[PDB]
């Protein structure tokens, strides 16, 4: 009641104040909440059109309905259309115009999924192949090219591949950008499962546990390959531990390096798409610590702007030194490395450290997931738990000055 | 003499979609058909005026073009 009312009023204020602070806002309400959400490297730019098209992989959270893996194609106006003088309003004194022609969000293909999709990721080299996490022990792989566009009338899903090695659900999945078929999985079973699907036969369906790691003594929260290293990856778990493993190491239980993360459990990790020595990890202690891969003993920088646990942290394919994180605060905070150690007035410091550059609090519910558009810069989609999906982009002057 | 409703609901909604709307009136459909009919009639009668003044029986699309310009619009690719 009171919380709902205050969130509604905060959202109304954000709605009223967004014209001055955002350049691109594209909000939609989902049929069902999605725990997963991501772009596609492919972009569609039809000739003779004033818009661009982008694609999105999301799931559904249905309590008693068949969860469907969803691809969503989204219409985006063109950069050429970004500069046009159509009309002028004498009232607002601007080249405004409400109009009716706008980009739109369209669901393309729905694939039946066994339970909620805990995490969905695809081939960095082949958008055809996507990996999804299930509430069951199973790990399922779907291909839109190898499945009817409309979800099958049969309630049962039709996975092209099922992977073995885990004993229950999890929330960590990743792919190897440099090595084909290399999957890293995390589960409550305290086991980290590495799987290779490049050698799976054409008619094969069950994939064995190629490698199982058991160094962590707590729930392995997330696992991810290195953006540049072909054999290195890191893991984060509830044991406030930042663990580094080498696939070339002969021991799957002895980690390559063992460094604690924080005083609280950590959720995820992320590396620079350009750099290879700096990684970002978010923790439950409202802190996000930077770690130089030259020395993991000392944190490069522990940013502090949230009031609660931080869930997902992601770097920028456009900008090397740009990072944002979202958690249960429903706030997405954009963080720059060029403002580190910069003096600021207290009037700009009541909110927090100058490390922050932007805050997105347009979420009615907790921000479920986000992804940064590799083609369009500063372009981000985020999803709240209330099946709310917006595509947004801030004011250009906040980063370009 | 009973083809006034020959204009289909799918066709009218599709015209609505091309122009860019999201909400449509329910009774507007007959008004759309009537505006269609009046403009059709003006066009075709004027084309008949040409073709008769063309001293011709079977009308051509050129007559269509001249009617189009006489009422005051442009035709693309056919001149």
């Amino acid at each position: 009641a009171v919380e709902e009312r205050v969130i509604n009023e905060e959202y109304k204020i954000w709605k009223k104040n967004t014209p001055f602070l955002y350049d691109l806002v594209m909000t939609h309400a989902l049929e069902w909440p999605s725990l997963t959400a991501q772009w596609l490297p492919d972009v569609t730019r039809p000739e003779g059109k004033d818009f661009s098209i982008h694609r999105l992989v999301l799931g559904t959270h249905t309590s008693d309905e068949q969860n469907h893996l969803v691809i969503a194609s989204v219409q985006l106006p063109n950069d050429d259309a970004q500069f046009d003088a159509s009309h002028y309003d004498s009232e607002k004194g601007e080249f405004g115009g409400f109009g009716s022609v706008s980009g739109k969000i369209e669901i393309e293909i729905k694939i039946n999924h066994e339970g909620e999709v805990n995490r969905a990721r695809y081939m960095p080299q082949n958008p055809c192949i996507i990996a999804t996490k299930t509430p069951s022990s199973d790990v399922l792989v779907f291909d839109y090219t190898k499945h009817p566009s409309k979800p099958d009338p049969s309630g049962e899903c039709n996975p092209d591949l099922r992977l073995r090695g885990h004993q229950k659900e999890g929330y960590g999945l990743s792919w190897n950008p440099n090595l084909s078929g290399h999957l890293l999985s995390a589960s409550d079973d305290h086991t980290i499962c590495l799987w290779d699907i490049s050698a799976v036969p054409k008619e094969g369906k069950v994939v064995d546990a190629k490698t199982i790691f058991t160094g962590h003594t707590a729930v392995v929260e997330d696992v991810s390959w290195h953006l540049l290293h072909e054999s290195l990856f890191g893991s984060v778990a509830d044991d406030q531990k930042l663990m580094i493993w080498d696939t070339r190491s002969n021991n799957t239980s002895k980690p390559s390096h063992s460094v604690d993360a924080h005083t609280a459990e950590v959720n995820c990790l992320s590396f620079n798409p350009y750099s290879e020595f700096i990684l970002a990890t978010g923790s439950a202690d409202k802190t996000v610590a930077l770690w130089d891969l030259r020395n993991l003993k000392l944190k490069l920088h522990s940013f502090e702007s949230h009031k609660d646990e931080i869930f997902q942290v992601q770097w920028s394919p456009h900008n090397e030194t740009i990072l944002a994180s979202s958690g249960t605060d429903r706030r997405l905070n954009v963080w720059d490395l060029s403002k580190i150690g910069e003096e600021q007035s207290p009037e700009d410091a009541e909110d927090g450290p100058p490390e922050l550059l932007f805050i997105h609090g347009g979420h009615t519910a907790k921000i479920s997931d986000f992804s940064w558009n590799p083609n369009e810069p500063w372009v981000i989609c985020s999803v709240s738990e209330d099946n709310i999906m917006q595509v947004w982009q801030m004011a250009e002057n906040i980063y370009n000055d | 003499r009973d083809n006034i409703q020959g204009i289909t609901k799918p066709a009218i909604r599709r015209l609505a979609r091309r122009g860019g709307v999201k909400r449509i009136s329910g009774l507007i459909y007959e008004e759309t058909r009537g505006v269609l009919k009046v403009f059709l009639e003006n066009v075709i009668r004027d084309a008949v005026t040409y073709t008769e003044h063309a001293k011709r029986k079977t009308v051509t699309a050129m007559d269509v073009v001249y009617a189009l310009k006489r009422q005051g619009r442009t035709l693309y690719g056919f001149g």
Binding site: - | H53, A54, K55, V65, Y66, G72, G79
Partner: protein
């Protein structure tokens, strides 16, 4: 020779149909008028830029037209302009001494075609008027008094082109029915009438109503000894092909020759009003006519414009693929340096001519025998 597509707002995207230069002033500066379905007549100022580019600027607008206009031509004097719209009326304007730098006022109120008008023609002096319309009727007007004097009703189909003999002895008219008629001045009757020709199979030389063209414009040579007819048909074999026919005063029944134009169809014919010396060439039958002084003219096809001189049969100047829609009108500058191209897309285009690029204009203009 450089070609400039005019991207500027001519008639706020409504197609252009007619255009004319100022013959009265021989100065480098020129005053240009245009015809569109916006029922708006827009005067534009054009001249070569510092880079030689034909840059244009608005001058004044006319909005009295209740209907679209089709043909716009100044007097040979250029001081008075003839304006013709769909509203079946023709008004004459003269400049009078926020977006109009000058005011142009109706001077005469001429009617007589009670339909949409296609073509207008001025006399060799600007005091007699010729006009063509839907109405299948050829009219004659006196500019001095501004009343109708003659009506020619012999046409069966639409008439898209009329021209006045610069000598002042002929009036040439075409029907859309592939029929060509020449009219005397004193006799006021069909001096010549040609529709079909034997080769010796006989077939009609001009294109039928089946053409997707709106205008069939043509002009007398300023010398007046050569007659030019677009929208011709040549049936070399089982097929027919687009061409234009060239006629001399010796015989208006049999044209001297023709210019086949592969692909698109001719629709307008205009001759530059300036003369030039005979270009040095081998003494052959290449020249269309042997004359002491040469002249150059422009021809408007469906899409292309082609440039021919007195000495050469093939076109020396060729331009194509510039306007997306079909062509509408072509105009010659008084000096001949500006060749204004108008099409039906909604824009115009210019081809700038450098001085002497087309020869030396005659020091003294040869007189024409009246």
């Amino acid at each position: 020779m450089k070609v400039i597509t005019c991207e500027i707002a001519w008639h706020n995207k409504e197609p252009v149909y007619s255009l004319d230069f100022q013959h009265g002033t021989a100065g480098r500066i020129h005053r240009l008028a245009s015809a569109g379905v916006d029922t708006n007549v827009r005067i534009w100022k054009v001249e070569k830029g510092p880079d030689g580019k034909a840059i244009v600027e608005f001058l004044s607008n006319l909005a009295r037209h209740t209907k679209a206009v089709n043909v716009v031509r100044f007097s040979p004097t250029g001081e008075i302009l003839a304006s013709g719209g769909d509203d079946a009326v023709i008004l004459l304007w003269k400049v009078n001494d926020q977006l109009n730098k000058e005011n142009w006022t109706v001077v005469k109120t001429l009617r007589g075609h009670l339909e949409d008008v296609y073509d207008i023609c001025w006399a060799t002096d600007g005091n007699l008027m010729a006009s063509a319309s839907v109405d299948n009727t050829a009219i004659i007007w006196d500019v001095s008094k501004g009343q109708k004097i003659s009506i020619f009703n012999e046409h069966k189909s639409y008439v898209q082109g009329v021209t006045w003999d610069p000598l002042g002895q002929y009036v040439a008219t075409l029907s859309c029915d592939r029929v060509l008629r020449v009219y005397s001045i004193q006799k006021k009757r069909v001096a010549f009438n040609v529709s079909k020709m034997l080769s010796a199979r006989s077939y009609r030389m001009f294109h039928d109503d089946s053409m997707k063209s709106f205008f069939r414009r043509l002009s007398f040579t300023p010398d007046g000894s050569l007659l030019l007819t677009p929208a011709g048909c040549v049936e070399s074999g089982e097929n027919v092909m687009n061409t234009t026919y060239v006629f001399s005063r010796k015989n208006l029944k049999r044209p001297i020759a023709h210019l086949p134009c592969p692909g698109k169809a001719t629709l307008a014919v205009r001759c530059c009003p300036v003369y030039f010396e005979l270009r040095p060439v081998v003494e052959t039958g290449v020249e269309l006519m042997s004359l002491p002084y040469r002249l150059v003219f422009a021809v408007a096809s469906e899409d292309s414009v082609l440039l021919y001189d007195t000495q050469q049969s093939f076109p020396f100047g060729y331009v194509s693929n510039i306007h997306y829609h079909t062509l509408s009108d072509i105009s010659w500058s008084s000096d001949g340096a500006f060749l204004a191209i108008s099409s039906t897309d909604g824009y115009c285009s210019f081809v700038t001519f450098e001085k002497d690029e087309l020869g030396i204009p005659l020091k003294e203009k040869p007189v024409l025998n009246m």
